Amino acid sequence: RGWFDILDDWLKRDRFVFVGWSGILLFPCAYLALGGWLTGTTFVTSWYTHGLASSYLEGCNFLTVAVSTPANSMGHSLLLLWGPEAQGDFTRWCQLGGLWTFIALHGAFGLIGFMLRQFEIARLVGVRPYNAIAFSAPIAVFVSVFLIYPLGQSSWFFAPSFGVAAIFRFLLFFQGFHNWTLNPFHMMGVAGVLGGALLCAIHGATVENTLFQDGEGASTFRAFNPTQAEETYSMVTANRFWSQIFGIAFSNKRWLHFFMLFVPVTGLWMSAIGVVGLALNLRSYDFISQEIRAAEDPEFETFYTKNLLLNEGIRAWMAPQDQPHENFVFPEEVLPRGNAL
Amino acid sequence: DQESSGFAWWAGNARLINLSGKLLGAHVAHAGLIVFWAGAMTLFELAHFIPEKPMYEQGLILIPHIATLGWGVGPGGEVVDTFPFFVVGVVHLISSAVLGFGGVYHAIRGPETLEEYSSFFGYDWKDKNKMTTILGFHLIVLGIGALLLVAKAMFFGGLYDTWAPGGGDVRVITNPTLDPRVIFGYLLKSPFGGEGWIVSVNNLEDVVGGHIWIGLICIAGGIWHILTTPFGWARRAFIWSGEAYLSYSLGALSMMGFIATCFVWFNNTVYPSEFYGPTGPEASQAQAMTFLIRDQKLGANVGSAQGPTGLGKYLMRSPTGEIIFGGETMRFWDFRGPWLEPLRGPNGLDLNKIKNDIQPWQERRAAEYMTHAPLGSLNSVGGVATEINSVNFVSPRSWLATSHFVLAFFFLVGHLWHAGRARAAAAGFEKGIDRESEPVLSMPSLD
Amino acid sequence: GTTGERPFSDIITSVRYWVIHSITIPALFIAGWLFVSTGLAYDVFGTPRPDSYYAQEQRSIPLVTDRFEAKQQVETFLEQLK
Amino acid sequence: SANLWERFCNWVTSTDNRLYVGWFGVIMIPTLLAATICFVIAFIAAPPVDIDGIREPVSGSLLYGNNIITGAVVPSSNAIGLHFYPIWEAASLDEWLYNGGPYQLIIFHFLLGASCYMGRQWELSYRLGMRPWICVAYSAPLASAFAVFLIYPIGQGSFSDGMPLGISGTFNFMIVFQAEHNILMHPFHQLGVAGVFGGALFCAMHGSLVTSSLIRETTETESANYGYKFGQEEETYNIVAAHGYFGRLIFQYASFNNSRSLHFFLAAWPVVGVWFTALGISTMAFNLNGFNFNHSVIDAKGNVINTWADIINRANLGMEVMHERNAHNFPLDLA
Amino acid sequence: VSYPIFTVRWVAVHTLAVPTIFFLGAIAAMQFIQR
Amino acid sequence: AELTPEVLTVPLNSEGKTITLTEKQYLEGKRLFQYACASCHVGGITKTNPSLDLRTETLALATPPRDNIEGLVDYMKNPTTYDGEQEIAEVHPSLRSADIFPKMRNLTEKDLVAIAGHILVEPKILGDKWGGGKVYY
Ligand SMILES: CCCCCCCCCCCCCCCCCC(=O)OC[C@H](CO[C@@H]1O[C@H](CO[C@@H]2O[C@H](CO)[C@H](O)[C@H](O)[C@H]2O)[C@H](O)[C@H](O)[C@H]1O)OC(=O)CCCCCCCCCCCCCCCCC
Ligand code: CLA
Ligand code: CLA
Ligand code: CLA
Ligand code: CLA
Ligand SMILES: CCNc1nc(NC(C)(C)C)nc(SC)n1
Ligand SMILES: [Ca+2]
């Protein structure tokens, strides 16, 4: 009909790599995000930013490389290539960690585009959008952790830097400063991811070892009817198995599969809320009743008190080279340490 | 001959389950790869080997195996002649070509099956006798081998005895413990702290002695199987098939793999700290030795020193009363070692010997072993995870122990997997539930 | 089971393909190589050369300390180097 | 009586039992009841345990000041190391509870039973005519409990270094582990998180794809679940519509159409990944730790140029330097 | 069939294909820098 | 920011006279220092006796002075206690005891000079790091 419907027509055309309206947002961003990372990983440094070598060009390996956050001076600045900081200049932008907000913000839109895609492709193919609902979980994580979090802190500098090792310190930090492992929400988080990776494994095996024989071969893979018809595995046998070994067992594939969506998506949602709270530093650091008894009574010791001391050490020995902008100077005598070590 | 209408590509080797001949090429070609390695690696080690430097500081794991059998070494594990190393290496490397020949031959030219090209070699998995017999042949070959060691030790040269009276040295064992009460005693030993089971072997007589028993006991069973068939239970108990037999041998290796991991990690005797590194406990012990030795020279009375907790900076007591080194090292009070024994009394570390019988060679032994504990990183950076780069080293004992726990493990999975397959294969459902006769459907509802 | 695109398999096998890419691929490679080896990359990304982290004596870090006059501050850091 | 024992064996092995007490079960059921019963009592009323062998009792039970999150069953003493400490090895229970005896009684019975639990996951599959291997999936989580409760202690020389039985006690095991082994920088742990992250990921993929491509048979105001009856002949979702959507999300050949290959992958991934994670802990149990890139990148003069690998080392030193305050008397931590 | 050349798939394939090799080339070169 | 010959100029003897090492000797020392020292002196400390380090000042107050090529060299041949009132060649690697510490057999006067030079050059580059321990890592 008209240019719009013709533009549409073209886009929604069934190619090898479906484009679609969504693609107009997805691909530009998704590629820029992936690109910026791959660029910084090998070329840009984090010297003027964290006093750290962070690229292959400097000597870092796939584990130690990363696109480090901007200085703490920048604050929450969007750090646009043409903004007050970089001032249109590219190299400076690079040295001021412009590549972080670049990857961050771009990838962010890229996750919007992608979920939209699922939504758009779902609609076309005429299937229900539970693949999109599910993907809300990963959005929440990215949003709360790479955006909401540092937005509550002093600046982007405390957001997780893009890189393998550069993420491990994000972990260690959270233990040491937020005592994050003791947080009810992080726990739910893991219960879901850990519990989700169980349903995955357990359901898979239950199916492969509860299959009907539809072939004469040993390699039963070929024996499958790509064109529906009968259930390829004995749902009835599976039920009896677990009902006798675990005591409880599914018996409604519709529920067994919905459950599998729920468990890990709910888990990640919870782990997000916990972090949205760590933004304001509203952590789950201590148990007051415990601290009070530990003060008055020097012989009371739990695996909890023990941990808190591990945190003190993490904070004292890391803070210096981890928060350069604070020009920390901790005399050897002030550094907490046990005996001998 | 055999393609996809046998098994899937990635399960290819199972297409040889019933082609005795070709299934022989595999085993003969494979056994070639092991000799090839053993040989080719030894020369690699020797090519890098530096005489005047610890073996453990050179990433060696074969030369130290030869050294233990008393070859190219002398007083204290000093390397004398590198020839036996070069020899053992090249010889194997050659035999690899011979075997490899046969393998390739039997797998792509010779008979694809054996039963007809000679009924002696051809075989039938369910042939309880052929099986019991071939097993019997191998049970003898292994038995001779066990004696091949007893010989090298008693007649041909000896073995490296670190406990050597005059101090570590190659010694000829001419008095193997044959007393069954003792030999087999080991098997009745706890596998926990202190009583360590097999790994507690601590002198060459038992090693040699015990191997004498195994060699005989082994060949004896080799003849017995040659001359027999499984009884009744032996038959109503096991599964008789190509896979089932495999499985049984899989679980067997797994177990030997775990036992080996602990031997190289704990044992001091058959794994001399002189060629490998100091044991885990041995190194923690040496730190205590080192500092009790140091501070004592500065005028400290080790016997009465009180540490932060009020337990005893240098010396404390174990749960059953014996005097041991203090500190976290209290967990390794079961460590025994040439260098440290002369300080032990009838009640454990003697405060008088510690006070004036410590010898320099011991002080530097303790120092050496202290600074060569089995702590290191994947990229080989010796020390604690927080250490700095410089000393490129990872104890041979760490390498061996980890590699073999992984292998030992996966093999236990291998066992479960091939055993699970064999039981379903036998009864016959390893390809799916009979759409028609679905067993579960004939059973009452537990409800 | 199909769309317009010419089945990769066919292309990765066409002698035309290799006749084209045997030229193109190494082309791109040698280019990037030179990008690094000519020191150009260092300037495109303000990344320090092994001899440009600190001034000879100084052992302090060139930490950018304020957003707006950042670029200016960075430039001055390059001034001590040499 | 067709023969008592003959009968017994028919019951035990009976596939008509609500819960299949198998042959492996005969060992499982008792060991697991002991482990469970001892734990629950311990966790609630056990008194302080001198975990580090330095006479500095760590109380970890509810009645002694702990809450669910902090409370735990504390590991046997370090004075004990790897020695066997059965109740009949103590002058009294008072002595046994002080040296952390309950810990061993629990870990040993649990590990024992949890293995038979695997042996059972095979047996029932056999008595039911289904293919084995499910028990092989369960070998991963088991191989972990083993690594964390036995291998690591054997390797380290003491049961006091095994993972405690409690929430916070576990975080302790982790935080310290990291300090002494730098696990986050080890290939095996990474494969572990790939498997776990991936699992949860895939678990969500499958779960959604399927649930979203279900054939309509339900009302607008009726649980979409009822559209399935236990004991159906044909499938309850359009696996061809599922593949149709997912193939377009990414691209066709990068999408499953074979339910069997889908489900194998679904099981293979996590199990394989966790297998490596378990081998990681079992490997770092002999001190072959993660990559140590401390002071790798250095400049033209020799100055040390830090990488994130170094910022990680500081955080590790803090842990090293503060764990086990009073347990060390010497320079190097070789235990 | 009479398949075309420059297609949408082609574009994509190159957006990732081209840069990659350019990087693999860059990196391969770094392996020789020193001090 | 480089290892100039200006940095490789370290005191040769007690009477102020100096010597200038070359980037070859340096690297060579560094390699030798790893081959026969790191084991116990990694990063300038001393694992089997943390009280004595290789910090130049520590070596300055040693007895005799061991903060110059001549000094360290003598030491690597005939080692003594910090007051020099006792020879320790029996429990410390040295030339007069290579039979006991093989790693010291190859070592020739050329090598001893490099190792010595490294010890005086390192702190010049690393500074506080060289002496202190984990606190500075
Ligand atoms: C469901 C199915 C799942 C399937 C999963 C399959 C997973 C398969 C994992 C397979 C293999 C893991 C292999 C590990 C190899 C380790 C090699 C190594 O340790 O090699 C060590 C060497 C050496 O490192 C070097 O170590 C060196 C020095 O040591 C020393 O050397 C110096 C002199 O040169 C001095 O003497 C010094 O004192 C001494 O200590 C230097 O420090 C170097 O600077 C340092 O770079 O390794 C290096 O450089 C290494 C750079 C390494 C990058 C490594 C990545 C490793 C694993 C990644 C897994 C990713 C998974 C992703 C999954 C995604 C989706 C599933
Ligand atoms: C490690 C040892 C090993 C061995 C000994 C074998 C042996 C064998 N395999 Mg496997 N296989 C292996 C590993 C191994 N395989 C692995 C890792 C995989 C997974 C990729 C497979 C997958 C597989 C499949 C899918 C199939 C086999 C089959 C076979 C048989 C094939 C006969 C044939 O067609 O020859 C063909 C041989 C050639 C074309 C050339 C090979 C030459 C080899 C022998 C040597 C190369 C070395 C060197 C050049 C020789 C120098 C020798 C020296 C003395 C001079 C044979 C007995 C087939 C079968 O089961 O049939 C019943 C089959 O279908 N295998
Ligand atoms: C590791 C096990 C192994 C086994 C079980 C076999 C088994 C067999 N082989 Mg091989 N073979 C092997 C390894 C093995 N081979 C290797 C490594 C090579 C390469 C060197 C060969 C090369 C080979 C060839 C070229 C031929 C066979 C043949 C045969 C079959 C002969 C049956 C027959 O008709 O009567 C023959 C009776 C015998 C072969 C037994 C006599 C063995 C004597 C000659 C040598 C024993 C070895 C050694 C010298 C003893 C140690 C002495 C000590 C002092 C050091 C038989 C099934 C033949 C065949 O295909 O038949 C159908 C054939 O032509 N094999
Ligand atoms: C090297 C491999 C090897 C292999 C594969 C076999 C295999 C076999 N042998 Mg044999 N044997 C061997 C070496 C070997 N033997 C040697 C060297 C000797 C000389 C002593 C013998 C002497 C021998 C005799 C005298 C007999 C067999 C028999 C049998 C068959 C027994 C079936 C059975 O139920 O066993 C499984 C064993 C059991 C079910 C018993 C349970 C024992 C419990 C108490 C402990 C199990 C171990 C424990 C859980 C962990 C280890 C503890 C540690 C302290 C040992 C079987 C096919 C029997 C047969 O029928 O021969 C024709 C028979 O009577 N063998
Ligand atoms: C000790 C002897 C042993 C023997 C003789 C066999 C023999 C056999 N196994 Mg088996 N297995 C073993 C141990 C053993 N296994 C162990 C310890 C495990 C636990 C992991 C398994 C797990 C296992 C499974 C899960 C399966 C088999 C299968 C099979 C059959 C496969 C046919 C084939 O084509 O190979 C296939 C070989 C390959 C496809 C090669 C790929 C190997 C990959 C997975 C790992 C490579 C590891 C290497 C170290 C990595 C280096 C990479 C490099 C780039 C650096 C065959 C009869 C298959 C079957 O159908 O059995 C009836 C099957 O599905 N096995
Ligand atoms: C049947 C729907 N297709 C499909 N494809 C894929 N492909 C990967 C690579 C994610 C396993 N996964 C799923 S969910 C297990 N489904
Ligand atoms: Ca230079």
Side-chain angles (χ1 to χ4, degrees), chain F residues 10-14 16-75:
Chain F
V10 302
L12 171 66
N13 61 54
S14 31
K17 180 172 170 59
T18 63
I19 182 180
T20 285
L21 300 180
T22 68
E23 181 160 349
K24 292 179 163 63
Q25 294 195 288
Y26 177 66
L27 283 176
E28 199 48 36
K30 192 183 201 291
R31 180 189 88 74
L32 299 182
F33 179 90
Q34 297 194 5
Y35 172 83
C37 328
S39 157
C40 296
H41 285 294
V42 34
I45 62 80
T46 304
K47 283 175 185 159
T48 65
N49 191 326
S51 291
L52 294 165
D53 54 44
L54 301 186
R55 292 168 166 305
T56 309
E57 293 82 5
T58 293
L59 286 170
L61 281 50
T63 337
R66 268 66 164 56
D67 64 300
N68 54 62
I69 302 299
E70 279 316 321
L72 305 165
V73 178
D74 168 80
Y75 194 103

Side-chain angles (χ1 to χ4, degrees), chain A residues 61-63, chain B residues 377-382 388-393, chain D residues 187-188 190-191 194 265 268-270 272-273 276 291-293 296, chain F residues 34:
Chain A
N61 71 69
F62 173 64
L63 270 41
Chain B
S377 54
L378 213 54
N379 69 304
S380 284
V381 197
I388 308 296
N389 268 286
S390 72
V391 50
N392 196 307
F393 153 80
Chain D
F188 280 45
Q190 301 160 176
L191 292 203
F265 185 66
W269 188 259
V272 64
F276 277 106
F291 294 106
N292 183 324
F293 304 115
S296 293
Chain F
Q34 297 194 5

Side-chain angles (χ1 to χ4, degrees), chain B residues 195 260 310 318:
Chain B
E195 325 293 342
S318 74

